[PDB]
Design a protein around this ligand. Structure first.
Ligand SMILES: Nc1nc2c([nH]c(=O)n2[C@H]2C[C@H](O)[C@@H](COP(=O)(O)OP(=O)(O)OP(=O)(O)O)O2)c(=O)[nH]1
Ligand SMILES: OC[C@H]1O[C@@](CO)(O[C@H]2O[C@H](CO)[C@@H](O)[C@H](O)[C@H]2O)[C@@H](O)[C@@H]1O
Ligand SMILES: [Mn+2]
Ligand SMILES: [Mn+2]
Ligand SMILES: [Mn+2]
Length: 129
């Protein structure tokens, strides 16, 4: 099956809220809440991918970020490796730059059922910060 490397950014403000977008109805993991991110392209690193993806999707440049979690998940029709970067400093103000819904969500109120199942251990670990 398809095998993908995905870089996503956990965008956390000083009020313990995370900037979360909602995936399109015709996408893989349609209508799910998500950390902004996307496919790591040939010739770019995981760190470069999370910067580019957040610039494209929500209009911020992450800086001084860290790898929060790396995990693999087997979906029904594809295998993905997810790189979860914790982003606590950035240039810009995140918004729905690609026309997608985005909003700040309290960390304590996140419901892992709203996200792709691959995010389950990450959402749990975030709540223990
Ligand atoms: N962006 C994102 N994707 C996730 C998360 N959890 C998770 O399992 N995924 C999966 C869903 C997709 O199968 C894949 C993400 O790919 P994507 O749809 O963001 O790819 P992309 O932005 O590069 O796509 P495109 O705009 O180039 O069309 O990883 C998450 O928190 N954020
Ligand atoms: O890989 C993340 C990890 O590396 C450190 C340095 O030890 O940060 C470096 O890499 C980050 C991601 O590219 C950069 O944002 C950062 O500026 C750079 O120092 C750690 O801070 C981080 O845990
Ligand atoms: Mn994208
Ligand atoms: Mn992409
Ligand atoms: Mn994406």
């Amino acid at each position: 099956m398809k095998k993908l490397q995905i870089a996503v950014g956990i965008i956390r403000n000083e009020n313990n809220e995370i900037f979360i977008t909602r995936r399109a109805a015709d996408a893989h993991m349609a209508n799910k809440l998500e950390f902004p991110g996307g496919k790591i392209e040939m010739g770019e690193t995981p760190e470069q991918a999370v910067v580019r993806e957040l610039q494209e999707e929500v209009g911020i440049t992450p800086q001084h970020f860290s790898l929060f979690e790396k995990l693999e998940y087997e979906f029904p029709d594809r295998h993905i490796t997810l790189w979860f970067w914790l982003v606590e400093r950035w240039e810009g103000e995140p918004w729905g730059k690609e026309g997608q819904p985005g909003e700040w969500m309290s960390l304590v109120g996140l419901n892992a059922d709203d996200f792709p199942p691959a995010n389950e251990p990450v959402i749990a670990k975030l709540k223990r910060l």
